[PDB]
Every structure is written in structure tokens, then in C-alpha cells.
Amino acid sequence: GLPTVLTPGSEQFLTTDDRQSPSAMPNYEPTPLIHIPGEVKNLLEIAQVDTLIPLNNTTNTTGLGMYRIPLVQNMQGEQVFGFRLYLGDGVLKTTLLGELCQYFTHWAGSLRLSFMYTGPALSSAKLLIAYTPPGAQGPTKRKEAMLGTHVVWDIGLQSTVVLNIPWTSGVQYRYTDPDTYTSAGFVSCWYQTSLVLPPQTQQTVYMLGFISACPDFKLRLMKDTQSIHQE
Amino acid sequence: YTGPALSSAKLLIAYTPPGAQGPTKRKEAMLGTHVVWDIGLQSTVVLNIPWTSGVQYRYTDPDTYTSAGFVSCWYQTSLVLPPQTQQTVYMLGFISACPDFKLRLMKDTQSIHQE
Amino acid sequence: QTLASIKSDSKHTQKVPSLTANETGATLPTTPSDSVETRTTLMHYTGSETTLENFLGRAACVHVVEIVNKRPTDTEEHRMQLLFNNWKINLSSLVQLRRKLEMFTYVRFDSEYTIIATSSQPNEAKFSSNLTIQAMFIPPGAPNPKKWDDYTWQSATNPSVFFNVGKSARFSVPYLGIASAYNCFYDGYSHDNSTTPYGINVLNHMGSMAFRVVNEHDNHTTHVKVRVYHRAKHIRAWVPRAPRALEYLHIGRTNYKQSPQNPIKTRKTISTY
Amino acid sequence: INYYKDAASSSSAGQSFSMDPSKFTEPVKDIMLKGAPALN
Amino acid sequence: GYSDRVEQITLGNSTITTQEAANSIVAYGEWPSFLSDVDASDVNKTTKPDTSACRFYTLDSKMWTQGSKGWCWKLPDALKDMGIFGQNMFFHSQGRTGYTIHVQCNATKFHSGCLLVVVIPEHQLASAEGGNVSVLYDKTHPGEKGIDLSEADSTGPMKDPLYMMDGTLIGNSLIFPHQFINLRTNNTATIVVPYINSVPMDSMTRHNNLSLMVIPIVDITATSGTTPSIPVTITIAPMFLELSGIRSKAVI
Amino acid sequence: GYSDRVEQITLGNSTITTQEAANSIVAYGEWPSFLSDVDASDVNKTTKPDTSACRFYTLDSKMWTQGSKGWCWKLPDALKDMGIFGQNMFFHSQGRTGYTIHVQCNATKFHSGCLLVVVIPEHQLASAEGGNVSVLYDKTHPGEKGIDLSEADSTGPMKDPLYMMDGTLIGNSLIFPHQFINLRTNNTATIVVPYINSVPMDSMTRHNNLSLMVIPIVDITATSGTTPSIPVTITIAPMFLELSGIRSKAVI
């Protein structure tokens, strides 16, 4: 009989532990695995897939209206949209990326936004998409927005613009959950020129917002989400 | 020494090993380990207090048995200030471990409390 | 081994190691051999005891909570009545540890926790009960239980620990950042606003640890105190600083009493031995 | 000797280091205890 | 030959010349330098203003008289109005820099007294009110004015220099990079400090890195005459200024 | 580099540090050393107390004021009460030693005046009474007190410093190992003296070897103020102390 010593933690149940254990079904032979399309190895593979942003989550907006960003006629220098950038909250709370990230405490790495213009082929516009790093409020004017990271989008033949939002942080990781200290700043869009529709045409046109992780996107520590409850 | 550049003094810095009391007189102090400090151009004197012990370790906490003796300073000559000058001047004392300094066994301090 | 001292005989020279200038900020090393004649002798010492690792590597009580086994009362939240008790993690609570950590500006380590539960029955209980205690780690942004038996306790993604009263749990937690080192102090704000809170509380987002008595209500109230101990591992620290002299008032603050007691004891005269 | 894979689970090894007090005692640019005057 | 007490510091388009100085200090034995490619987490190409910012700026001098308690400045805050450096602090999300700090205090051979100049990283201040009261932004960001420990302020930080506004005795503050100005010998202190943080780069406005304190350990005095009054001048320069994340000027 | 005016003397467990000194003197160009096997006539194995005796001892300081005539100490007598050295003088029949002698006298740049420090071997003193009167033991062996040339004593030695208590003019005393303390420059004198005798070893009590005299050639004075008074401190150490002939403590 080998002398042994027990240590603190003996017989504890730790839900994150990994140990070997006896099989309840000795010599069992599992059903052979066949090729099934769509195998997933990492959640980060999923995080890189674009999903829609319910950006127009305004009061009294219903149905699919939340995923439609209105653009209209003769607006110049006006704000199209804007939101404080949160990963596990705000307008991104219910996105795929958002929900995946709600399972993690910390997040680092760049994000991508993209916008699809769905208006008439004969229409045109130029939009400014801008990102304002932490340490400032707003922007409230295009003149402020242009001082951040931005792209001017020529809504022409190609319908989609991609804005890569860089990891503008002095902190290696930010919190997924809302946090003043590690806040990610703001995202906004302004009319660079204006929406122009064919003569005598008056209507609202829309664009769709999308979000995905960049290849450099990182998630650090798993946790439960706040997006589900049970009685 | 932080007094006037025009001032001067000589101080005796002395260490008295365990097994004696005082010193009460300079004549006693001079019999221990000492240095005479010429307070001139360089402002700082360093006195290395040797491990004058028959015991390999002393207690950090007050202890008669392992007491470390006494430190004292005497006016070797006197403080001399420029003519017609009358004032107190000061010096600052510093302490540090020598390269041979050793600490042997960790314990809680008595310098903090909590309710 | 190395020498503590090297034999040195009487000197009469131009080199004077005994004179310097502390104004430089230097603390140039000197030895007894610079002031007195000396015998050659060995250190017989490695300094192992004084390593940072050994200093901050001893377990210390961090926090104590109390939870009970009691029939829920309709009029009180399960936090008002201690059926469940969520500790916000902060090593500053029990100040002996706090000082040892505050001695450095930046500290990095992995943590090891030990959790010990003890029950008591101050009432007319007819028998003891070795209650099962659950601890759940709740990272920032994770759901905070509302009820002792809430869905949150499923711990689908939250690390959790189960142990019995009289037993203990032990586990390691890797350095949680988010920075490259933990800050002991923070001379700043969460953001640029006059009314924003000042100090390390800004950065202390380690989440919280929820405790629960797993067992259903018995026929009497049982009180369980859970003591959490912490030990650092693989410890690195930067920029040492002077230890606090005055009594601490509140967690995360360097505040002290408006009329503090001078830490320095006095004597009748500078000449008193 | 290691039973777990996370580094955090390892024991508090175990590697001593030499001392380097010069960071705190001799940060002063270009000096040495030569017995030479500190300021000249 | 050369003497340690005589030195010239050239930085950008500015110089400092000293004749009575103590050897300068390079805090923790390390020079200021730029962020490496293995430290950085910021994907944005950084800006290096060099000369335009990395030059000496002088803060309004303060008078040292008997009874003075000492003064404290915060960095980078103290330089927030200093030309380009100042402006860069508000146009960038984050930045990184070391400093060269010079404390100057002239006197004659008939004067005595001694200042302690200490640079304290992350000097989290105690509120004057004690209790659980925090210190307001306005009182931790005085800019050039600094904090005069001689001036009462019921909403400010603790002022009594015995404790360096944090419950820690001044006697042990010498653990921090420091230098004395002993009017007997040197009349200036010089300290070079590398960027120190847990984060590669950080906000230049919501957070200070260094706290520069100058405390009259020994009161100023003359051999004769009335209470002396000697100005104390502080000159500070960014060493390796690296900036990132350009955006609309911060408003605070 | 180094300057001649700055020096450290380490001896036994004691040190002396000077910043304003003249180059020390080694009398007659020879260092103190131990008796060789071709000098000795004493068959008794000698004792070499080393550190226990060969350390600096300080004699009670005397004040230098205008009108002071100077002072004289006899060696080894002056050290007869100095701890171990002292005791060894009485427990041994004979002994041998050289000395290091330090005369210290601090002053400011507003002071002037000059001491002459002379070590005179076999300084046979003239009696105050002149004639054929000898000087009594008691007056040649004052110990630490020394002989104050300013103090009248009808039974003591001649006191007028013009002649160094022996009918020989002071002007020519510079033939002996000597050094000046010119308050203008140095503030201390250092003289190292080898054992000097016709006999390898000798009594430590019936005979002195050296006579240390300190004479204010130029009276102490200040540029302004009242008559100055500056202490003169003398510190002396045995160099190579060699003893022989242990016996019951001498009683005198």
C-alpha cells in the first residue's frame, strides 16, 4: 500500500475540470462517422460570417424594419445613423457576433461593418462611414466624424462597402459587457453628398448593415449569456 | 549634511556592539566602531555597521539576547557657521541594507490592523 | 558559495568609499570592508526566503461570506435573506494581503483559490447537516442570480465548484488581465468626466463569485460561513513602492483619516537610547 | 510530474534568479563607486 | 576633462545647461524608447511627432519660502496646454511617452535647505475628505498649476507632505526614482523616466502616469536676513512620444 | 581622479576622512615596521596586539583662542589610559611602536591663523625653575591632558613657545618632522612616525619617545566678530605595536 496524502480539493466537483472516468458501457462500438458538410472547429470560424445589424431599432419600429437603414432625399451633411459601439449590447446585442460574444468576458481585435445599398439602380449617393475611438463623445456633426477613422462610400455599381474598424485601444482586451473604462467608442454615418433619385422621384431607400469579426478577432474567457432565462 | 555651503563641521558617527550601555560620553563612543565625517565638499558619509555578532542571526523583533547595540553621533569638533551667523542646520539620516544582508523566516507584521 | 566579506586590512588612501552624495539618488553599494578591517567569511545564504515568489506565494484569507439554509420568505430577496451571497472579487478586502500586494505598482500572477466552508446551528436543530456548497464564478457581463434556485445556477458556461461543508475546494485561475499586469493603483478615471470615480476601482472588473447552499430547506436554519483564501503563483511584479503606513478605510481607495495617528512612535529626546 | 495542461495548474516553480539591485540603487547615469567624488 | 556636475541636455530645439548638478537618473535603469512590434496590440500606424513635441517645456515657477509644504504635478496632464504636445493629447486616443524632468532651484553659498524630487508612478491620491470620497477630475488635472501642498482645499487631495498624499510615509518614498536638491551642492535635479504602464499605450487624458513631487525636506533658510524666497522651476520634455488613434479633439 | 587634499586613513576598526588636508608626512622617509631578527636582543617572543591597540584614539580637544601659547603631548604617555593600548603599557616591560598623528582644526574662509605641528623625538624639557632643577615625573606624564603652554606652573617645564621648552628657537624646529595647519588651506595635519630609539624596545612608562607640539604661530582670528574659538582635536594611533616582557601591572 503506497503511502499517499490527500490535498484540499479532494472530492470537489469542478465543472470546468477534465479527468478520466469509467465507462458505463464497456466495449460499446459507436456508430461510424460519415462525412457531414459544415464541420465546425472554432467559434471564431462562425464569428467571421456576416449577419445583419438591427440598427434601426427605434421605438415603434417593427418586423424587419429594424434591419433597414433609411436614406433620403436632399439630406446633406446629415446623420444617417449612429450608435455607441458595444459588443455584448447596444444594436449589436442580438447579432451573431454579439450572441457569440455574450459567451465571453473579454474581446479584442478588429470588427467589420458593411453596408449594402438596396435602392434603385438609377440612384446614387455618397456616404461617410466613420468610427470615433474612445475618449470623445458624439460625433454630432459631420465635421467631427471626419476626424476619426472613416471611409467614403461611392454607392455605384458595387452595392457593398466594408469598413474595417481597427483595434484602437491602449488596452489589450475590452470587456464584452458595457464598461466605461474599456468602451469602444462610436460608429456613425453621414451623408457625404446626398441621396439622388431620378427626376420627380420621391421615396425612402434603404441599406442593410452587416457585422462580422476580422481574422484578428479574439475572445478570451467564457461566461454565461444574459440573453436567456428560465422558470 | 544640508547646511550652508560656507559651513563646516566634523562629526563622529559611532556604533557600540552589544554588551555595553550608552555611550554617554564621546570618550566611550570612540571606543566602538566609528568614523569621523569631514563635512566638506561631499555631503554624504556612509557608515557600514559590521555584523558584530556571536550569533548567526538576530531577531527582528526586540530581544535582549540578540540585541544589536547602539548607534550614536557626537560633535568631533563643532558646527561652524560664517561670522555673526546663528542658526540650526540639519542633516538627514538614511538607512539601507548591505549586500551581505540576510532575512531568514517570513511572518506577519505588527504595523497593520483591521476591524 | 559566495563571500559575505573579504579580508581587508587597514587602509590609508585617496579612494574614499565612505564619502558620497546621496543627492545623486544613488545608493552605491558598500561593504563593511570599506569602513572597517574584516575577516573573510561566507554568506551561507541564497535569499530563497526573500524571493517575490515566496513572499506573495503564501495563501491568505481574502474574503468571508455567509449563506444560510433557510425557508425562503416571500417578502425578501434571496440576497436580503442570505440564501445567496455574491462576493465581488477584490483582494483588498482583508488588508494584510492588500499591503503585501500594494508594495508593488504592477503585479502579475496566476491565482490559486482555496474555499473552505463551516456550518453552525445556533438554533434548536436536532441534527447536523453536511451541506453541499456551490460556488459559481460570474465574469463581468454574466447573469447575476436573483434566486437561490435561479436558472443561472445551471452554470452552463460559468466555472463552478461543488464541495461539502467540512471539505474544501481548490482550483487555479490564470492571470485575467485584461492588461499585461494587474494594477494595484490607478491614478485616473474610467473616462474624461468631472464626476467619474477615481482610483483602482475603475479597473477592478474581475467579476464576482456567487455562493449557495445547494441543499433544499431543512427543518431548521443552518448558517454557513465560507472563507476564501488566495495564493499567487508565478508571480512577477514591477515598480516597488513604499508600504502604506496609515490604516486603510475603504476598498480601492488610498484614503485615510482626516486626523491620522502618526505611525512613528516618539521619545523624550533624540539622544535617548 | 505535471498532471494538468493549463500553465495555471502548475506548481509555483521553482526557478531562482540572481539579484539586480542596480535598477533601484544605481539608476544614476554613468557612475561607479570608485571611491572618487560623487559629484566630480 | 569633464566633471559630473557640468552637463548639457539637448532635446529637439531646446537645451538645458547646468554647472551644479547631480548625475542624472534613468529610472529603473532603462531609457525611454519606442514601442516594439512584439509589445504593440494597436494595429494603427503610430505617429512620432519627434521634435515638434519632444522638447523642453517650462512650467510656471513656484516660490519656495519657509513653511512651504511642497508641490505636485501630474504627467502628462501638466503639459496639456504645452503647444503641440498639448494638442496631440486631445487629438489622439492613446499615446506613449517617457519624460525628462528637470527641477531647478538657485541659491548662494549662504543658503541651505533641501528639496526632495520624486517621480511616483500611478500615484493614486487620497481625498482631503477621507472616508470613501473620491478625488474629482478637476483636482487631479490642474495642468501647469500643479497641486500646491501649502494650499488648503476641502475637496482636494490630502495635503500633509508627511504622507505623500496616499497614507504612505515620505521617508520611504526614496524607493521611487528620486533625486535631491541640496542647496549646499547641486542646484538642480534631473530624472529620466521610461514609459511605465501595464498597457502598451494609453489615454493621455483620463489617466496620469507619473506624479512629480517636490518636497522641502529641509526648509529654505539663509545665514542672515529675512525669510528667503527662491523660485523653483520645472522643465519637462517628452522623450519618445508615440501617438495613436486620431479623432476629433477631445473636449473635457 | 584624485586630489592630494582628499584622503582616507583606515586603521584597525577606525577611520579618518579628510577633504582639506596636506599630503601626509612619513617622518624621515621611513614607515613604521616590526623589529627584525637582526635588531632584536630580546629573546622573549613578542606580542603584536594589532587591531586591539592599533586604532585611532582621540585626545580631549583643546580650544584655540587668541593668546593661546600652544600645547604639548608626550607619547606613549598620552595614550596611557586609552583602552587596550593603555593597559598594555603597564603589563609589559618594554615595547615598540610608531604612530600616526592627526591634528584637526576646522575653520571657515573668514578665518585665518596657523598652527605648527611638530614631532620632536627625545624632547628633554627645561624646568620652569631653571637652574639645576629637574622636571618631576608628574609634570612630564600628564597623559591626555597634555601640557598647556598657556598655563603657568612654577614646578612645570618652561612654557614660553619661542623656545620649545628646551632653549632652542622654534624657528628651527622645522628641522623635525612637521606640518602646518594653515587655516587658509588645509584644516588638518597628518604625521606618521616610525619607532625612533637607540634601543630596539624600551619601557613604555619611564620614558617618552615623541613629543607632539602644536603651536599657534599665527594667532587665530576672524575677519569680523569676537575673538574666535576653535577646538583642536588630536587623534593618535599606534602603528606597529610590539610588546615584550609580561609582568604584574606596573603601578606608578
PDB file of N, CA and C in Angstrom, chain E residues 1 5 17 31 34-35 51 88 90-91 107-108 125 127-128 132 145 164 168 190 199 210 215 227:
ATOM      1  N   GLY E   1      39.308  68.066 -19.033  1.00  0.00           N
ATOM      2  CA  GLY E   1      38.467  66.926 -18.696  1.00  0.00           C
ATOM      3  C   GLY E   1      37.046  67.366 -18.414  1.00  0.00           C
ATOM      4  N   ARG E   5      29.259  67.213 -12.448  1.00  0.00           N
ATOM      5  CA  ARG E   5      28.378  68.297 -12.101  1.00  0.00           C
ATOM      6  C   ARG E   5      28.032  69.228 -13.257  1.00  0.00           C
ATOM      7  N   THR E  17      21.443  73.776 -19.772  1.00  0.00           N
ATOM      8  CA  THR E  17      22.825  73.732 -19.361  1.00  0.00           C
ATOM      9  C   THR E  17      22.925  73.863 -17.870  1.00  0.00           C
ATOM     10  N   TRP E  31      16.269  53.440 -20.385  1.00  0.00           N
ATOM     11  CA  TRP E  31      15.935  54.573 -21.196  1.00  0.00           C
ATOM     12  C   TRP E  31      14.587  54.435 -21.827  1.00  0.00           C
ATOM     13  N   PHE E  34      10.852  53.567 -28.107  1.00  0.00           N
ATOM     14  CA  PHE E  34       9.593  53.321 -28.808  1.00  0.00           C
ATOM     15  C   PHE E  34       9.046  51.925 -28.563  1.00  0.00           C
ATOM     16  N   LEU E  35       7.726  51.787 -28.682  1.00  0.00           N
ATOM     17  CA  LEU E  35       7.031  50.508 -28.519  1.00  0.00           C
ATOM     18  C   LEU E  35       7.483  49.522 -29.583  1.00  0.00           C
ATOM     19  N   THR E  51      10.643  66.087 -32.675  1.00  0.00           N
ATOM     20  CA  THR E  51      10.992  67.438 -32.286  1.00  0.00           C
ATOM     21  C   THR E  51       9.826  68.348 -31.997  1.00  0.00           C
ATOM     22  N   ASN E  88      -1.653  67.363 -29.165  1.00  0.00           N
ATOM     23  CA  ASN E  88      -1.629  65.971 -29.534  1.00  0.00           C
ATOM     24  C   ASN E  88      -2.331  65.092 -28.525  1.00  0.00           C
ATOM     25  N   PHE E  90      -5.071  65.607 -27.148  1.00  0.00           N
ATOM     26  CA  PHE E  90      -6.501  65.651 -27.307  1.00  0.00           C
ATOM     27  C   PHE E  90      -6.937  65.136 -28.651  1.00  0.00           C
ATOM     28  N   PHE E  91      -6.015  65.052 -29.580  1.00  0.00           N
ATOM     29  CA  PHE E  91      -6.357  64.547 -30.898  1.00  0.00           C
ATOM     30  C   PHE E  91      -6.083  63.081 -31.068  1.00  0.00           C
ATOM     31  N   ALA E 107      20.520  79.111  -5.586  1.00  0.00           N
ATOM     32  CA  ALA E 107      20.797  79.651  -4.266  1.00  0.00           C
ATOM     33  C   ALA E 107      22.256  80.013  -4.147  1.00  0.00           C
ATOM     34  N   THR E 108      22.617  80.726  -3.088  1.00  0.00           N
ATOM     35  CA  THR E 108      24.005  81.067  -2.865  1.00  0.00           C
ATOM     36  C   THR E 108      24.587  80.164  -1.816  1.00  0.00           C
ATOM     37  N   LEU E 125      -4.199  59.328  -5.433  1.00  0.00           N
ATOM     38  CA  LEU E 125      -4.305  60.283  -4.338  1.00  0.00           C
ATOM     39  C   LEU E 125      -5.429  60.013  -3.372  1.00  0.00           C
ATOM     40  N   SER E 127      -8.288  61.468  -0.920  1.00  0.00           N
ATOM     41  CA  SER E 127      -9.133  62.663  -0.836  1.00  0.00           C
ATOM     42  C   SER E 127      -8.968  63.379   0.461  1.00  0.00           C
ATOM     43  N   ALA E 128      -9.045  64.696   0.421  1.00  0.00           N
ATOM     44  CA  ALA E 128      -8.985  65.521   1.616  1.00  0.00           C
ATOM     45  C   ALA E 128     -10.092  65.180   2.588  1.00  0.00           C
ATOM     46  N   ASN E 132     -14.885  57.487   2.046  1.00  0.00           N
ATOM     47  CA  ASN E 132     -14.938  56.827   0.750  1.00  0.00           C
ATOM     48  C   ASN E 132     -15.058  57.838  -0.368  1.00  0.00           C
ATOM     49  N   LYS E 145      -0.658  74.384 -13.222  1.00  0.00           N
ATOM     50  CA  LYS E 145      -0.778  74.941 -11.898  1.00  0.00           C
ATOM     51  C   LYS E 145      -0.214  74.003 -10.861  1.00  0.00           C
ATOM     52  N   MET E 164       2.733  60.981   1.410  1.00  0.00           N
ATOM     53  CA  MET E 164       2.696  61.609   0.098  1.00  0.00           C
ATOM     54  C   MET E 164       1.352  61.482  -0.560  1.00  0.00           C
ATOM     55  N   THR E 168       1.177  56.885   2.825  1.00  0.00           N
ATOM     56  CA  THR E 168       2.479  56.266   2.879  1.00  0.00           C
ATOM     57  C   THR E 168       3.540  57.292   3.259  1.00  0.00           C
ATOM     58  N   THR E 190      17.805  66.074 -12.150  1.00  0.00           N
ATOM     59  CA  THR E 190      17.385  65.591 -13.458  1.00  0.00           C
ATOM     60  C   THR E 190      16.986  64.132 -13.425  1.00  0.00           C
ATOM     61  N   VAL E 199      -0.249  48.670 -19.813  1.00  0.00           N
ATOM     62  CA  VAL E 199      -0.796  48.730 -21.152  1.00  0.00           C
ATOM     63  C   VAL E 199       0.198  49.438 -22.095  1.00  0.00           C
ATOM     64  N   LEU E 210       2.648  59.570 -14.297  1.00  0.00           N
ATOM     65  CA  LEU E 210       3.639  59.941 -13.316  1.00  0.00           C
ATOM     66  C   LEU E 210       3.163  61.057 -12.458  1.00  0.00           C
ATOM     67  N   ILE E 215       9.343  68.186  -2.573  1.00  0.00           N
ATOM     68  CA  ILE E 215       9.071  68.488  -1.182  1.00  0.00           C
ATOM     69  C   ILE E 215      10.289  69.032  -0.427  1.00  0.00           C
ATOM     70  N   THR E 227      13.208  86.012   5.700  1.00  0.00           N
ATOM     71  CA  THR E 227      12.871  84.756   5.081  1.00  0.00           C
ATOM     72  C   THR E 227      13.173  84.830   3.593  1.00  0.00           C
TER      73      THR E 227
END
